[PDB]
């Protein structure tokens, strides 16, 4: 079933109503995904869900810029991670009952007014969210609705996976891939057979195709599987102790122990879309 309220849309799977996803209209932000009653995503206990600021947890949507830009006249004007997660999207309706599937839209006319004034480029975004019995798919289409100007942008899904204990967690299937390390400010090949975590981690892997599934492992069990289409980059992030302590909406302060962000996107460079052209991609979460 599909249920809309003033603030959000909630999908529940017809075959098992304890499998669900909650999507806040603000940012079209998925903030809970339960698989047979078990929460898959991390959400801060101090996360704002009231539209006052972006949600600390779930799946914030990052567009038209990842991180902070300082090289482009217009993109440099925006706050870190852009304006999609700061805007209230329109619920466009359901498109399927089983699997329950719904769409959200964004265009400048309904976006964050302040940020739209700073980056007055034309676009249409359509997010499609599909809740399967054992997966969650979040798909995006971007259309350049300008008749004259190119549209230049990044796209990333800022997925917060929920885990039991960060220090017991490993991430597999990134061995031998090139990354840019946002902390060390250098690029190198990951020579470790799996990714492990014992300090702040902020890295951007490159050249991940539709064929490469990334697995999150704990006690020899695959607790999450991430697949994507048309998003060659993967940000892997955990703020660790000090950065968690510094984020006012991040609670509890030990909560970095229960999250890992594995974020598929197109962020290594900008996509440029000619007038009237479209780009699309998706993230597919499951538990293989
Ligand atoms: O606090 P936010 O603007 O949501 O950003 C959170 C994180 O996003 C990243 O750029 C990648 O996850 C990190 O460096 C960290 O800043
Ligand atoms: Ba940062």
For ligand 1, mutation pick of 67, 184, 197 (most atoms within 8 Å of CB): 67
HEC profile of 233-268: EEEEEECHHHHHHHCCCCCCCCHHHHEEEEEEEEEE
The torsion angles phi and psi of 9, rounded to 5 degrees, stand at -125, 135
Neighbouring CB atoms inside 10 A of 96's CB total: 12
Q: What is the DSSP string of 6-63?
A: SSEEEEEETTEEEEEEEEETBTTEEEEEEETTEE-B-B-TT---SSSS--SBSB-EEB
Tokens encoding 177: 């891939």
Distance CA 202, CA 119 (A): 27
**90 CA to centre of ligand 1 in angstroms:** 25
**Hey, whose CA ends up nearest to atom 12 of ligand 1?**
237
What ligand 1 atom has the least distance to the C-alpha of 60?
Answer: 4
> How many domains, the chain?
1
3-class DSSP assignment, residue 85? helix
Token pair 């300082």: residue:
70
Report the relative pairing of strands 151-157 and 135-143 from DSSP bridges. unpaired
Distance CA 139, CA 155 (A): 11
**115 CA to centre of ligand 2 in angstroms:** 20
Sheet holding 90-96, edge to edge: 90-96, 101-106, 124-131, 135-143, 278-286, 221-229, 214-218, 169-172, 195-196
Report the relative pairing of strands 38-39 and 195-196 from DSSP bridges. unpaired
CATH of the domain at 57: 2.70.98.10
Neighbouring CB atoms inside 10 A of 243's CB total: 14
Spatial contact of 225 and 214, defined as CB atoms under 8 Å apart = yes
Token pair 């090289």: residue:
71
Dihedral sign from CA coordinates of 71, 229, 100, 171: negative
> Taking Cα atoms as reference points, which of 230, 225, 224 lies closest to residue 210?
230
Distance CA 163, CA 216 (A): 9
**Hey, whose CA ends up nearest to atom 3 of ligand 1?**
80
The torsion angles phi and psi of 111, rounded to 5 degrees, stand at -80, 175
DSSP assigned state of 66: S
Spatial contact of 216 and 223, defined as CB atoms under 8 Å apart = yes
Neighbouring CB atoms inside 10 A of 164's CB total: 11
Distance CA 270, CA 151 (A): 9
Spatial contact of 195 and 236, defined as CB atoms under 8 Å apart = yes
Distance CA 262, CA 130 (A): 20
**64 CA to centre of ligand 2 in angstroms:** 17
Radius of gyration of the CA atoms of the chain, in A = 18
Give the list of residues 6+ apart from residue 133 with CB closer than 8 angstroms, or none.
13, 15, 16, 19, 99
From the list 13, 143, 224, 263, the catalytic residue is 263
**Hey, whose CA ends up nearest to atom 7 of ligand 1?**
237
Spatial contact of 159 and 167, defined as CB atoms under 8 Å apart = no
Tokens encoding 78: 């925006």
Residues facing residue 63 across a β-bridge: 82
3-class DSSP assignment, residue 84? helix
Give the residue ranges of the annotated binding site for substrate.
56, 80, 85, 202
What ligand 1 atom has the least distance to the C-alpha of 54?
Answer: 4
What ligand 1 atom has the least distance to the C-alpha of 202?
Answer: 14
**81 CA to centre of ligand 1 in angstroms:** 8
Give the residue ranges of the annotated binding site.
56, 80, 85, 202
**Hey, whose CA ends up nearest to atom 8 of ligand 1?**
67
**122 CA to centre of ligand 2 in angstroms:** 28
| Active site annotation includes 288 | no
Distance CA 169, CA 135 (A): 21
Distance CA 20, CA 196 (A): 30
The torsion angles phi and psi of 109, rounded to 5 degrees, stand at -60, -25
Neighbouring CB atoms inside 10 A of 13's CB total: 21
Resolution, rounded to a tenth of an Å? 1.6
Dihedral sign from CA coordinates of 24, 265, 86, 272: negative
From the list 13, 81, 158, 224, the catalytic residue is 158
**Hey, whose CA ends up nearest to atom 14 of ligand 1?**
202
Spatial contact of 178 and 57, defined as CB atoms under 8 Å apart = no
Q: Which residues of 118-130 are buried (b: 16+ CB within 10 A; e: fewer)?
A: ebebbbebbbbbb
Give the list of residues 6+ apart from residue 202 with CB closer than 8 angstroms, or none.
181, 182, 183, 235, 236, 237
Give the list of residues 6+ apart from residue 9 with CB closer than 8 angstroms, or none.
2, 3, 22, 23, 25, 91, 102
- Residue 272 belongs to domain spanning: 1-288
| Active site annotation includes 158 | yes
Question: Between vectors from CA 74 to CA 128 and to CA 85, what angle results, nearest 5°?
Answer: 30
HEC profile of 93-130: EEEECCCCEEEEEECHHHCCHHHHHHCCCCCEEEEEEE
Q: Is 48 exposed, middle or buried (0-12, 13-18, 19+ CB in 10 A)?
A: middle
What ligand 1 atom has the least distance to the C-alpha of 182?
Answer: 14
Residues having CB closer than 6 A to ligand 1 are 67, 80-81, 182, 202, 235, 237, 261, 263
């Amino acid at each position: 079933p599909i249920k809309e309220t003033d603030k959000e849309v909630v999908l529940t799977h017809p075959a098992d109503e304890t499998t669900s996803v909650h999507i806040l209209k603000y940012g079209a932000t998925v903030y809970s995904w339960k698989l047979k009653s078990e929460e898959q995503l991390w959400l801060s206990t101090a996360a704002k869900l009231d539209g006052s600021k972006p949600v600390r947890g779930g799946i914030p949507l990052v567009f038209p810029v990842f991180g902070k830009n300082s090289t482009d006249e217009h993109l440099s004007k925006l706050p870190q991670h852009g304006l999609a997660r700061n805007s209230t999207w329109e619920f466009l309706g359901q498109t399927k009952e089983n699997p329950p599937t719904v769409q959200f839209g964004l265009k400048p006319e309904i976006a964050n007014p302040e940020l739209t004034k700073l980056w007055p480029m034309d676009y249409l975004l359509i997010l499609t969210v599909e809740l399967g019995s054992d997966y969650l798919k979040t798909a995006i289409e971007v259309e350049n609705t300008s008749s004259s100007k190119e549209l230049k942008f990044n796209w990333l899904f800022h997925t917060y996976f929920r885990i039991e204990d960060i220090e017991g967690t490993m991430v597999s299937n990134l061995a031998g891939m090139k990354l840019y390390d946002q902390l060390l400010k250098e690029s190198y090949v990951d020579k470790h057979p799996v990714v492990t975590f014992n300090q702040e981690t902020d890295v951007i892997y490159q050249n991940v195709s539709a064929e490469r599934a990334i697995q999150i492992v704990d006690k020899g069990v695959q607790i999450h599987t991430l697949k994507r289409y048309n998003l060659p980059d993967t940000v892997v992030w955990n703020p660790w102790i000090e950065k968690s302590q510094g984020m006012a909406d991040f609670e509890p302060k030990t909560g970095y122990q229960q999250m890992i962000c594995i974020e598929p996107g197109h962020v290594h460079d900008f996509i440029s879309l000619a007038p009237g052209k479209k780009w699309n991609a998706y993230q597919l979460l499951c538990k293989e």
